[PDB]
């Protein structure tokens, strides 16, 4: 039955990604004053099903300078790790109650970065090379500030376990003891998610989608589903991490309702941020990241060191 | 040279890092606490040569606390003899989990 | 003036400097000390019968010993 | 009380395993039957094989590896 | 307005309503109506281990209360 | 007749699936490209039909040759066209592309783009309207309704 | 059924890490290296260490990221080498894997392996914790001593890291 | 004896010989130095974990932060090497002769 | 090894996606699709061509501040000790030294070139 | 080298206090209250001698004290103590804060009647 629980985690991620592509296209259409998919049956749904089926038709092809092992083993690591992030997520009681999950979040997100990098390398067509190096750039920028802001926000109340984290999210939301740290965290995760050209330089119009400019049409489903799992993934991690829900004891469905509605409203907020801002810039990303975030983050870190040592508000980190 | 301005200035800024039986962050034992206590109390006011001569037994007792090499030698001998006689078929023992 | 050339830096130095200065003056520091000493993971060991020590009581209900009381007393 | 239950359990495992050894190894030469490995006589802490030897996989995996990656 | 997008949001929300709901329903099904006993530390692990010891089945979730007082 | 019946159902499935999305790429030489951009205008949406821009040549289904195909362009056109998966389709959009058109009697101008690639659908008009181009895409979807590929494969 | 799973993870670790050490192109070297780092994290996590392995996997990963950036930057061939591309790399990979499987044979089906020490060949459920009452997951406090007792040690650590920063800056500046 | 000790020493010796003999790249050399670091790390950590040597468990974290900053120093020097040449093989090292 | 069970199931999911990509749907007629695309022109040599980089300090800077992240991460478990003021002193010294390093290479224009 | 003398299953036949873990952990306050004076003799023996197979007479003593304690708590109020420990058993781990009203019921029961 444990296998049944694993299957009931890896089945709704498929449906989540496909119907979220529907959501992206139609919300973005009504965002940009036009109309979304409407002719295809009831409003869209069977056409995103047809998108998945159509992309499985496409019969992909290997390039010349395209070492087969690295080539077809890159997006496998992408999709598998974009899944296996979802193990310690505390949808009301998580799949595996690990004693720490957030450094695991860090490591598996970095694995998603490496899989993007290896696909952009072994595509071996110079545009995926430029895009892979831009991905290296936005990973140099955004795997430090995210880590130290994480250290700050669980410095206050965390003790590394998500069940104690939902206990700490009880009287007030943790948006209010750390609000500008939350602003910087949301911008950093929006960068790391590699959607939202507010902080995305991989899916360019200057290049053509620097991860997989010329990959193949077959594993585009793998890559596409992996990054939208990344979107839902970090937004659910947001909706656990900062704000939350007063769960009923011995009834989790109300927690699921409040948690899911807050998470998908923040996901619509994320897509609504993607809709309206221009693309951004390599050295400006370095400039903005370091010379705007990093001293203010360190100041928040030392101030959340000094706060529970001066208010006796230290956690019961057993 | 070997300098102990460490010892002279009255600050043990390094020597807490050193051995078990120093006080842990919570007062918890190591695995071989008592054996180090044995070996130091054999070899405290000793000049490291008759320590080699005469505290040799309790030092070997400490080394076999740390590694348990002879105990694993004994247990591996017992398991391999058990496996050869169960491959044999002479008096297959059931006394674990049963009579 | 000196403010908005790169003003997030001034904001960082300000909140960092008050983070340095602020543990000098507080009424809660020794509270933090006594809480963070008075909560053990480990076991309160017994000891030998006594030489009639006028401390260290015989029943845990006996109020001769140093207990924790200021928690429920704010 | 948990200390007492654990002590009765480890004495039970040690008694049963000494008896099983004295039955199964009585024919081989050498092999004193119940010698401590160490030179002195103190209560040596058992090594999770003197407790858990020849228990055929599932019991030893339950005892050792349960807390690590299970639950 | 947004009147023509809400079926997509509702269907995709049920696609995120399902996994925690089925998760907790399976965990309540998986121990005879009791919650899955977590185990953080070694102490609670040994407590759960004597629990699975003193049920006889070597399944801890029965937990045999007040019956073997005598 | 259960074999041909099930194969007929599955062929109808995949042909519906092929005519569902159909995202093109943007080749777009001259003012026919401006008409493509006005086919991306909100008064005539293509994303009612799942029809999305996609600038890579590696995942589009149809390809719109729209503009005045010259000799300096045409080998690059076919070297885009070939590295594209096996269902591939061509929309000849505009009088320049569908037979040469207004620059027909000149050097350095390919007289009709059948001299480089095959063409499924011609849509004349200089430029086409957004409405006429949309009509051409609907007729191409009806061609994808007229496939009977898997019936041919079974009855072979 | 299986019991040697820590030793088997060590075997996979040594296989990938020797194919790492046989020096192909650093792309494939990093692939085998991150495979080895992940399974070594699995080794130390399954052995009893809670966070330290996942931590060092993260750190070591970021190091390999920068190493990949510079091997894209500098060392490129007209066609880079793979394991099965050249004679010498293939020979070294086969011989290292041969020594690995030979050690597997002498551990499994034999008694004793005595190359540098008389290593006791049997399963690593011994030696191990005999169910001691932790209640605080020992290595957590074992790292938490670093800010309690660790006065001098982090002083010299941070001082040497500050010197590392200015050293990299001046060697790059010294043009 | 815990057989993982011998196996990590085997991986140590092979990564050491890989660091010593090497064909042309300085990059592979720095990379395998980083690997041998990781091997010594994991070995020392398993030692401390069997010992319950909980007091000075500063060894893993501090050992590896120092050895990784050594690797940072090496990457800086490799930057200078590839700056003063195109190729960074065993060739274009033969000046400053013994 | 429950995580290993789940990793095995996701790898089987990934392999069935590989096989349903390649083998099942249709055929694979070759002979030009294997060519590398840039924009319509066959480029010189190939890629894996020596490509210089802009940042020189920023990658090593990432490396050293990731190591200092690694030092800073046991701040939650440190926060419960009897020697509170010493913990606060050394922690403030760690972050103050870190910010001194950052602001040093920031005022010595280490980041004002090809970032 | 040296030999050991492990005592057999003769003296180690004391009836195990076979409550499970939840009710046992729930009743820990009052079990500290009524009993748990004479068991510190056993605990002092164990800490000052560090060799079990020596103190186990007081192991029988602590086991009989606990079993007589649960005898006296079964033979009287509370019968809603059944409801109290089955309240504490469901709440994941042993959160002493989620189950409060029945704690007040059981403690006021035992405070009145005993
Ligand atoms: S056919 Fe007409 S509208 Fe199209 S490219 Fe030619 S001149 Fe322009």
Query: How does DSSP assign A7-62, residue by residue?
Result: HHHHTHHHHHHHHHHHHHHHHHHHHTTS--S-SSSSSSTHHHHHHHHHHHHS----
Torsion angle in degrees (nearest 10) through CA of A305, A306, A309, A311: -120
CA distance A93 to chain E (A): 6
For I12, the token pair is 């089987």
Check whether the bond before C6 is cis (ω within 30° of 0). no
Cβ-proximal residues to I58 (8 Å cutoff; 6+ apart), any chain: A140, A286, I111, I115
Q: Do chains H and D touch (3 or more CB pairs under 8 A)?
A: no
Q: Hey, is the C-beta of E52 within 8 angstroms of any chain J C-beta?
A: no
In degrees and rounded to multiples of 5, residue G159 shows phi and psi of: -65, -45
Tell me which H or E stretch contains G163: helix G151-173
- Other beta carbons within 10 Å of I26: 14
Q: Which subunits have 3 or more CB–CB pairs within 8 Å of chain F? A: A, I
Distance CA J104, CA J96 (A): 12
Q: Contacts of residue H9 in chain G, CB cutoff 8 Å?
A: 116
Q: Can you tell me whether residue J91 is helix, strand or coil?
A: coil
Long-range contacts of E50-55 (CB under 8 A, 24+ apart): E50/D2, E50/D5, E50/J21, E51/J20, E51/J21, E51/J22, E54/J16, E54/J18, E54/J19, E54/J20, E55/J20
Which residue reads 């010379």 in tokens? A291
CA distance I28 to chain F (A): 8
Residues in chain B, total: 99
For I35, the token pair is 């060519």
Q: Hey, is the C-beta of C40 within 8 angstroms of any chain I C-beta?
A: no
Helices (H), chain C: 7-21, 29-37
Judge contact between A211 and A128, C-beta under 8 A.
yes
Distance CA D32, CA D13 (A): 19
Distance CA F129, CA A83 (A): 46
> What's the CA-to-centroid distance between F64 and ligand 1, angstroms?
13
Q: Can you tell me whether residue F89 is helix, strand or coil?
A: strand
CA distances from I84 to B53, C31, G149 (A): 46, 11, 11
Helices (H), chain I: 2-22, 57-72, 75-78, 84-107
Distance CA B94, CA A278 (A): 75
Q: From the CB of F96, is ligand 1 less than 6 Å away?
A: yes
- Where do the domains of chain J lie? 1-114
Which residue reads 């070899």 in tokens? B43
Residue whose CA lies nearest to ligand 1 atom number 6: F96
Q: Can you tell me whether residue F92 is helix, strand or coil?
A: strand
Count Cβ–Cβ pairs < 8 Å, chain D vs chain J.
Answer: 58
Judge contact between A141 and A191, C-beta under 8 A.
yes
Distance CA E62, CA I58 (A): 59
Give the CATH fold of the H1-86 domain.
Answer: Helix Hairpins (1.10.287)
Judge contact between F67 and F29, C-beta under 8 A.
yes
CATH code of F142's domain? 3.40.50.12280
Q: What share of chain J is helix, strand, coil (3-state, %, to 5)?
A: 60, 0, 40
Query: How many domains does chain F contain in total?
Result: 1
Residue whose CA lies nearest to ligand 1 atom number 2: F126
- What is the per-residue burial (b if ≥16 Cβ within 10 Å, else e) of B38-52? bbeebbeeeeeeeee
Cα Rg of chain H, angstroms: 17
Q: From the CB of F132, is ligand 1 less than 6 Å away?
A: no
Distance CA H10, CA F45 (A): 65
Q: Which subunits have 3 or more CB–CB pairs within 8 Å of chain G? A: A, B, D, E, H, I
Torsion angle in degrees (nearest 10) through CA of A26, A31, A32, A37: 10
Judge contact between I112 and G173, C-beta under 8 A.
no
* Strand F121-123, strand F89-93: pairing: parallel
CA distance D51 to chain E (A): 16
Q: Do chains F and D touch (3 or more CB pairs under 8 A)?
A: no
Distance CA B41, CA F113 (A): 98
- What is the per-residue burial (b if ≥16 Cβ within 10 Å, else e) of A223-234? bbbbbbbbbbbb
Helix axes I84-107, C29-37, angle to 10 degrees: 120
CATH class of G2-172: mainly alpha
**G147 vs I53: CB contact, 8 Å cut-off?**
no
Q: Hey, is the C-beta of D67 within 8 angstroms of any chain I C-beta?
A: no
Distance CA G107, CA G94 (A): 20
Q: Chain J residue with minimal CA distance to D17?
A: J6
Judge contact between F85 and F45, C-beta under 8 A.
no
For H94, the token pair is 């033969």
- Where do the domains of chain E lie? 1-70
| Residue among B61, B64, B78 whose CB faces D25 most closely | B78
Judge contact between A97 and I24, C-beta under 8 A.
no
D30, D38, D48, D62, best to mutate vs chain B, most B CBs in 10 Å: D38
- Other beta carbons within 10 Å of A138: 22
Distance CA A294, CA I99 (A): 9
Residues in chain D, total: 71
> What's the CA-to-centroid distance between F67 and ligand 1, angstroms?
6
CATH superfamily of I1-108: NADH:ubiquinone/plastoquinone oxidoreductase, chain 3 (1.20.58.1610)
CA distances from A109 to A9, A77, D70 (A): 19, 11, 24
Distance CA H91, CA E11 (A): 64
Distance CA I103, CA I14 (A): 46
For B15, the token pair is 């020597």
Distance CA H62, CA G55 (A): 13
Smallest Cα–Cα separation from H42: which of A101, H50, B75?
H50
Residue whose CA lies nearest to ligand 1 atom number 3: F127
Smallest Cα–Cα separation from B60: which of B73, B72, B51?
B51
Q: Hey, is the C-beta of I31 within 8 angstroms of any chain C C-beta?
A: no
**B13 vs G120: CB contact, 8 Å cut-off?**
no
Q: Hey, is the C-beta of G133 within 8 angstroms of any chain E C-beta?
A: yes
**C41 vs B26: CB contact, 8 Å cut-off?**
yes
Check whether the bond before D44 is cis (ω within 30° of 0). no
Tell me which H or E stretch contains A122: helix A102-122
Cβ-proximal residues to A97 (8 Å cutoff; 6+ apart), any chain: A88, A163, D71, E38, E39, E40
**A97 vs E38: CB contact, 8 Å cut-off?**
yes
Q: In the Cβ-directed half-sphere of D48, how many Cα atoms lie within 13 Å?
A: 19
Report the nearest atom of ligand 1 relative to the CA of F34: 3
* Strand G112-113, strand G119-120: pairing: antiparallel
Distance CA I68, CA I61 (A): 11
Q: From the CB of F67, is ligand 1 less than 6 Å away?
A: yes
For H51, the token pair is 């010992």
Smallest Cα–Cα separation from I109: which of H80, G70, G172?
G172
Host domain of residue F155: 2-156
Smallest Cα–Cα separation from A301: which of A148, A186, A145, A141?
A148
Count Cβ–Cβ pairs < 8 Å, chain A vs chain C.
Answer: 50
Q: Hey, is the C-beta of J92 within 8 angstroms of any chain E C-beta?
A: yes
**Greatest Cα-to-Cα distance within chain D, rounded to the nearest angstrom:** 46
Smallest Cα–Cα separation from H11: which of G36, G92, G87, G49?
G36
Distance CA A282, CA A137 (A): 7
Long-range contacts of E45-54 (CB under 8 A, 24+ apart): E45/D66, E45/D67, E45/D71, E46/D2, E46/D6, E46/G131, E46/G133, E47/D2, E47/J21, E47/J25, E48/D71, E48/J21, E49/D66, E50/D2, E50/D5, E50/J21, E51/J20, E51/J21, E51/J22, E54/J16, E54/J18, E54/J19, E54/J20
Smallest Cα–Cα separation from F50: which of F58, F38, F62, F33?
F62
Check whether the bond before B75 is cis (ω within 30° of 0). no
CA distances from J71 to F124, J75, J77 (A): 98, 6, 11
Cβ-proximal residues to F129 (8 Å cutoff; 6+ apart), any chain: F35
CA distance A112 to chain F (A): 22
Tell me which H or E stretch contains I80: none
Judge contact between C68 and C33, C-beta under 8 A.
no
Pocket test for ligand 1, best of F101, F109, F132 (most atoms within 8 A of CB): F101
Cβ-proximal residues to G20 (8 Å cutoff; 6+ apart), any chain: G29, G32, G33, G36, H15, H18, H31, H32, H35
DSSP code, position A248 = B
Q: Contacts of residue I110 in chain G, CB cutoff 8 Å?
A: 169, 172
Q: Chain E residue with minimal CA distance to J81?
A: E66
Q: Chain I residue with minimal CA distance to D70?
A: I2
Residue whose CA lies nearest to ligand 1 atom number 8: F31
Q: Chain C residue with minimal CA distance to J48?
A: C47
Q: From the CB of F68, is ligand 1 less than 6 Å away?
A: yes
Cβ-proximal residues to E58 (8 Å cutoff; 6+ apart), any chain: E52
Smallest Cα–Cα separation from I38: which of A55, A141, A308, A207?
A207
> What's the CA-to-centroid distance between F96 and ligand 1, angstroms?
5
Q: For the residues of A184-222, what is the DSSP string, one character each?
A: HHHHHHHHHTT-STTS--SS-TTTT-TTSTTS-SSTHHH
Judge contact between A192 and A143, C-beta under 8 A.
yes
DSSP code, position G23 = -
Q: In the Cβ-directed half-sphere of E69, how many Cα atoms lie within 13 Å?
A: 14
Q: Can you tell me whether residue J53 is helix, strand or coil?
A: coil
Breaks in chain H after residues (C–N exceeding 2.5 Å):
none
G20: left (phi over 0), alpha (psi -120 to 50) or beta: alpha
- What is the per-residue burial (b if ≥16 Cβ within 10 Å, else e) of G56-90? bbbbbbbbbbbbbbbbbbbbbeeebbbbeeeeebb
Smallest Cα–Cα separation from A140: which of A269, A271, A286?
A286
Q: Can you tell me whether residue H59 is helix, strand or coil?
A: helix
Distance CA A109, CA A86 (A): 11
CA angle D28, D31, D34 (to 5 degrees): 130
Distance CA I72, CA I94 (A): 8
């Amino acid at each position: 039955m444990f296998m049944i629980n694993v299957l009931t985690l890896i089945i709704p991620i498929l449906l989540a990604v496909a119907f979220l592509t529907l959501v992206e296209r139609k919300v973005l259409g009504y965002m940009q004053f036009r109309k979304g998919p409407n002719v295809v049956g009831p409003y869209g749904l069977l056409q995103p099903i047809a998108d998945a089926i159509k992309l499985f038709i496409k019969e992909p092809l290997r390039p010349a300078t395209s070492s087969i092992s690295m080539f077809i083993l890159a997006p496998i690591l992408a999709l598998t790790l974009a899944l296996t992030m979802w193990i310690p997520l505390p949808m009301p009681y998580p799949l595996i109650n690990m004693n720490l999950g957030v450094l695991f979040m860090l490591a598996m997100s970095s694995l998603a970065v490496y899989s993007i990098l290896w696909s952009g390398w072994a595509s071996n067509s110079k545009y995926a090379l430029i895009g892979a190096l831009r991905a290296v750039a936005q990973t140099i920028s955004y795997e430090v500030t995210l880590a130290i802001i994480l250290l700050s926000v669980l410095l206050m109340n965390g003790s590394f376990t998500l069940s104690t984290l939902i206990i700490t999210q009880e009287q007030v939301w943790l948006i209010f003891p750390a609000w500008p740290l939350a602003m910087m965290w949301f911008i950093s995760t929006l960068a790391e998610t590699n959607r939202a050209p507010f902080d995305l330089t991989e899916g360019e119009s200057e290049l053509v989608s620097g991860f997989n400019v010329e990959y193949a049409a077959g594993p585009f489903a793998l890559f596409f589903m992996a990054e939208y799992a990344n979107i839902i993934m970090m937004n659910i991690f947001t909706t656990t991490l900062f704000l939350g829900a007063f769960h009923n004891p011995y009834m989790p469905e109300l927690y699921t309702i409040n948690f899911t509605i807050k998470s998908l409203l923040l996901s619509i907020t994320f897509l609504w941020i993607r809709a309206s801002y221009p693309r951004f810039r390599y050295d400006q990303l370095m400039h903005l990241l370091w010379k705007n975030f990093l001293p203010l983050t360190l100041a928040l870190c030392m101030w959340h060191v000094s706060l529970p040592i001066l208010l006796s508000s230290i956690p019961p980190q057993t | 040279p070997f300098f102990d301005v460490q010892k002279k200035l009255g600050v043990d800024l390094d020597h807490w890092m050193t051995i078990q039986s120093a006080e842990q962050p919570h007062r918890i034992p190591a695995r071989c606490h008592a054996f180090e206590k044995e070996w130091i109390e054999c070899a405290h006011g000793i000049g490291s040569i008759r320590a080699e001569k005469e505290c040799k037994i309790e030092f070997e007792d400490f080394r076999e606390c740390l590694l348990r090499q002879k105990t694993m030698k004994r247990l591996n001998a017992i398991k391999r003899q058990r496996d050869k006689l169960i491959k044999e078929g002479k008096y297959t023992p059931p006394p674990h989990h049963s009579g | 003036n000196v403010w908005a050339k790169e003003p997030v830096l001034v904001a960082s130095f300000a909140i960092a400097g008050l983070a340095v200065i602020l543990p000098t003056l507080s009424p809660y520091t020794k509270y933090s000390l006594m809480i963070n000493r008075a909560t053990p993971y480990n076991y309160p060991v017994p000891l030998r019968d006594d030489g009639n020590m006028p401390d260290v009581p015989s029943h845990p209900q006996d109020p001769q010993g140093p207990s924790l009381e200021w928690l429920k007393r704010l | 009380l948990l200390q007492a239950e654990k002590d009765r359990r480890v004495l039970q495992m040690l008694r049963e395993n000494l008896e099983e050894e004295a039955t199964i190894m009585k024919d081989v030469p050498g092999w004193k039957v119940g010698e401590s490995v160490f030179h002195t006589t103190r209560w040596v802490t058992p090594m999770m094989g003197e407790l858990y030897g020849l228990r055929t996989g599932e019991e030893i995996l339950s005892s050792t590896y349960g807390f690590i990656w299970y639950t | 307005m947004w009147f023509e997008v809400l079926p997509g949001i509702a269907v995709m929300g049920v696609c995120l309503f399902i996994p925690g709901m089925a998760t907790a329903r399976i965990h309540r099904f998986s121990n005879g109506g009791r919650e899955k006993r977590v185990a953080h530390y070694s102490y609670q692990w040994y407590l759960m281990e004597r629990d699975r010891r003193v049920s006889g089945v070597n399944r801890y979730y029965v937990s045999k209360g007040l019956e073997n007082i005598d | 007749s259960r074999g041909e019946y099930v194969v007929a159902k599955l062929d109808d499935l995949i042909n519906w699936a092929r005519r569902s999305s159909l995202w093109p790429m943007t080749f777009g030489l001259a003012c026919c490209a401006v008409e493509m951009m006005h086919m991306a205008a909100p008064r005539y949406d293509m994303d009612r039909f799942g029809v999305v821009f996609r600038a890579s040549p590696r995942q589009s289904d149809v390809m719109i040759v729209a503009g005045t195909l010259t000799n300096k362009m045409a080998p690059a056109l076919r070297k885009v066209y070939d590295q594209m998966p096996e269902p591939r389709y061509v929309v000849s959009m505009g009088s320049c592309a569908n037979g040469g058109g207004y620059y027909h009697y000149s050097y350095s101008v390919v007289r009709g783009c059948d001299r480089i690639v095959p063409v499924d659908i011609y849509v004349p008009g200089c430029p086409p309207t957004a409405e006429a181009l949309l009509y051409g895409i609907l007729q191409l979807q009806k061609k994808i309704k007229r496939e009977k590929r898997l019936r041919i494969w079974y009855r072979r | 059924m299986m019991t040697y799973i820590v030793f088997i993870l060590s075997i996979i670790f040594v296989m990938g890490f020797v194919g790492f050490s046989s020096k192909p192109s650093p792309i494939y070297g990093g692939l085998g290296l991150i495979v080895s780092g992940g399974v070594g994290c699995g080794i130390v996590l399954n052995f009893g260490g809670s966070f330290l392995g996942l931590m060092v996997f993260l750190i070591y990963l970021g190091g390999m990221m920068v190493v990949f950036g510079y091997t894209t930057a500098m060392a490129t061939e007209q066609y880079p080498e793979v394991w099965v591309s050249n004679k010498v790399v293939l020979g070294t990979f086969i011989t290292g894997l041969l020594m690995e499987f030979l050690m597997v044979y002498y551990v499994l089906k034999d008694k004793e392996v005595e190359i540098v020490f008389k290593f006791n060949g049997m399963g690593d459920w011994v030696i191990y914790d005999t169910g001691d009452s932790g209640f605080f997951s020992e290595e957590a406090m074992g790292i938490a001593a670093l800010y309690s007792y660790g006065t001098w040690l982090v002083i010299v650590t941070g001082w040497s890291l500050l010197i590392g920063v200015v050293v990299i800056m001046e060697i790059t500046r010294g043009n | 004896m815990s057989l993982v000790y011998m196996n990590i020493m085997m991986a140590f010796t092979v990564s050491l010989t890989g660091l010593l003999m090497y064909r042309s790249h300085l990059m592979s050399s720095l990379l395998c130095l980083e690997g041998m670091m990781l091997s010594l790390f994991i070995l020392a950590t398993l030692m401390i974990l069997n010992s319950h040597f909980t007091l000075a468990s500063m060894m893993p974290i501090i050992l590896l932060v120092f050895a990784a900053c050594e690797a940072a120093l090496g990457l800086s020097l490799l930057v200078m090497v590839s700056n003063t040449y195109g190729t960074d093989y065993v060739q274009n090292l033969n000046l400053l002769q013994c | 090894m429950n995580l290993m069970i789940t990793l095995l199931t996701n790898f089987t999911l990934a392999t069935l996606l590989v096989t349903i990509a390649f083998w099942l749907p249709q055929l694979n007629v070759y002979s030009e699709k294997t060519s590398p695309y840039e924009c319509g022109f066959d480029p010189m040599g190939s890629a894996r061509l020596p490509f210089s980089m802009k940042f020189f300090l920023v990658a090593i800077t990432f490396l050293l501040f990731d190591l200092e992240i690694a030092l800073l991460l046991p701040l939650p478990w440190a926060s419960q000790t009897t020697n509170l003021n010493t913990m606060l002193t050394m922690a403030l010294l760690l972050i103050f030294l870190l910010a001194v390093s950052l602001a040093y290479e920031w005022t010595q224009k280490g980041l004002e070139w090809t970032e | 080298p040296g030999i050991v003398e492990l005592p057999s299953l003769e003296d180690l036949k004391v009836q195990e206090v076979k409550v499970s873990s939840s009710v046992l952990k729930a009743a820990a306050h009052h079990y500290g209250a009524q009993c748990d004076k004479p068991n510190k003799e056993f605990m002092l023996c164990r800490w000052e001698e560090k060799d079990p197979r020596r103190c186990l007479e007081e192991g029988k003593l602590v086991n009989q004290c606990a079993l007589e304690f649960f005898r006296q708590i079964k033979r009287h109020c509370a019968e809603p103590f059944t409801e109290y420990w089955t309240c504490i058993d469901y709440s994941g781990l042993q959160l002493f804060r989620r189950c409060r009203k029945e704690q007040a019921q059981f403690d006021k029961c035992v405070l009145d009647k005993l």
